[PDB]
Write a protein that binds this ligand. Structure first.
Ligand SMILES: Nc1ncnc2c1ncn2[C@@H]1O[C@H](CSCC[C@H](N)C(=O)O)[C@@H](O)[C@H]1O
Ligand SMILES: Nc1ncnc2c1ncn2[C@@H]1O[C@H](CSCC[C@H](N)C(=O)O)[C@@H](O)[C@H]1O
Lengths: 338, 339
């Protein structure tokens, strides 16, 4: 009704960025009041019941490279950076975070490395160049992502990268790997039990699996609108029904792997990154328009996608900033095979 | 150290119950300030670091008159919390309510083999054996007098499905496996949960389950080390060893040999009310308690030291579990399967 009509106003510029923030603040408080319970007994039961529900699901149920070069940092990382102090640039945050992944996943030169859902190869190429004795295998289901990475290997003279074009949920191999990364991938999964069971078979003897997931600190939820006045949910997530995990949810999925270590990082880090994405978009908006008009085939369709990404950045920067980054945040889990 | 004189003053009856309660409220606020951190990153790191420290430790560190337990405890001599539906619920009712809750949550069925680790005076061992005559129930305790009490109860109650093994659980070797294992208020006596759960996991039969209940803090874990030089509680209540207060989530990090099927907590109101009932029963029978302790401990002064211990124990722990409407210290129940 108005949920369709309010959007078009935003796309015309009738809604300022601060009004967008004010709207998402309303969305945030409704989600938080929905998720929190007055007793720990109820709060825990809500989580366990949610985790059990994922076990009755399937394991799981496009963006122009020139645009990603503008919005994302130099490594095209499609996942948060680590900000030491916001003199930290977007480019610096990508490297800081990937070195943190390497430290926490206990990467050693010479190991075989598997990067599941490698995207445009930020971590695949980071590890391959930093540890030249490693063999790094990335898996992506995107032809253009694989082609970009293989082209980077040429420009960078890398001989130790292989990219496999597959659906991770259907992939099968007899090969095992010393280290497996899944950075911002379980966000696209539903039955974590089946996902971790399959991945576990790929872990070599004494190997490790490192997972980073966006989450809320306490509770988990499917992206379903909260009431009639909720537009964010189906605007940002039009199709499918994905899951926002909680920081502790993977602790309940240790049938085939066991937790070695578990960390969280404050929502400040993803918030600062989304702010940088928006700034880069805005500072180059004319070039963004030409890229999108060429790819999407018209001015109006180009500006709908531009509005999407701006709202995406503004809304998620507000969400992750909530209460000094102590609501939505990042969870990193290190697993060994079990 | 004037802490000794404080202790000797409590024993001679010059420190009121309200003073003990107030002392514990101060202790509680200190422990909470110590444990809580301003960011989840720090809070979680504190818990994971603590869990990892247990993995390098020993499984555990290397006698109460029966007539006293008959007075203080409920009818089944349960040395662990009851479940209070209302505050019409009596102590005796709370024991049965809780043991029936254990049977429900551990999915107990007639005919199963049951192992009750650290069975104490047999509240749950006897509860299950009486309820399910096709079950074979084995309890393990390291106390001769506890075993003898349970076997005497088996005579009185005409039960033939109970065996009590007299053993230290941390050194116990068996190749028997069991459909259901209980560890109720036992890991409170353990340090290396990893080593403990590894050993117990070998006793779980095919498709079997292990049910653990532990007292805990909701968020953080700690060893019973004094917080400062004014802390009397820690070393008065725990005159030996470096025992551990678990957190409600800590066993989630010990799933190498067992994996979590379900996980619940219950409010600190339940243990709080139980300790209040223990104290009331002690006080309502103080003359016999003195008679029992004067005989067992010989001197009226040593008897007073031990009466005082149990009163302070009940007062302080009732206060501790009541903190913030029962939402700080509480009970955690975890159901595990093998592998
Ligand atoms: N079943 C599947 N098989 C392969 N890739 C998948 C997948 N489901 C999702 N993905 C991909 O996984 C990625 C998650 S985004 C993160 C990409 C990369 N890890 C980084 O940090 O930059 C996306 O590129 C998405 O298209
Ligand atoms: N290593 C060990 N071996 C056997 N029993 C032990 C033990 N360490 C502690 N215990 C016993 O475990 C019991 C914990 S108190 C709880 C007893 C019983 N589960 C109940 O709920 O009533 C005490 O009896 C204590 O002495």
């Amino acid at each position: 009704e108005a949920v369709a009509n309010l959007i078009k106003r935003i796309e015309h510029g009738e809604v300022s960025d601060e009004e967008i923030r004010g709207m998402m603040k309303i969305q945030v408080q409704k989600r938080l009041k929905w998720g929190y319970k007055p007793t720990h007994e109820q709060q825990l039961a809500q989580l366990v019941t949610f985790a059990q529900s994922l076990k009755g699901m399937e394991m799981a149920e496009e963006i122009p490279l020139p645009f990603l070069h503008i919005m994302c940092g130099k490594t095209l990382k499609f996942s948060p950076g680590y900000f030491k102090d916001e003199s930290t640039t977007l480019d610096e945050s990508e490297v800081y975070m990937m070195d943190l992944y390497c430290e926490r996943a206990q990467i050693k030169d010479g190991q075989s490395i598997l990067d599941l859902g490698c995207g445009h190869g930020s971590l695949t190429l980071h590890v391959a160049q930093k540890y030249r004795g490693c063999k790094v295998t990335g898996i992506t289901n995107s032809v253009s992502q694989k082609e970009f990475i293989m082209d980077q290997c040429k420009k960078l003279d890398l001989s130790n990268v292989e990219i496999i074009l597959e659906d991770v949920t259907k992939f099968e191999t007899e090969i095992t790997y010393d280290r497996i990364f899944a950075v911002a991938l379980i966000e696209h999964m539903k039955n974590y039990e089946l996902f971790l069971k399959k991945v576990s078979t790929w872990i070599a003897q004494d190997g490790l699996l490192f997972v980073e997931h966006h989450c809320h600190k306490v509770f988990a939820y499917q992206y379903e609108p909260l009431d009639e006045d909720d537009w964010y949910t189906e605007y940002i997530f039009p199709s499918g029904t994905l899951v926002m995990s909680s920081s502790s949810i993977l602790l309940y999925f240790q049938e085939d792997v066991s937790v070695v270590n578990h960390w969280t990082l404050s929502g400040k880090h993803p918030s600062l990154g989304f702010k940088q994405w928006l700034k880069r978009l805005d500072d180059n908006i004319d070039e963004v328009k030409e890229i999108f008009e060429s790819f999407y085939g018209s001015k109006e369709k180009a500006m709908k996608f531009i509005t999407y990404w701006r709202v995406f950045c503004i809304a998620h920067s507000q969400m992750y900033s909530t209460n000094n980054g102590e609501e939505w945040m990042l969870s990193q889990v290190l697993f060994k095979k079990k």
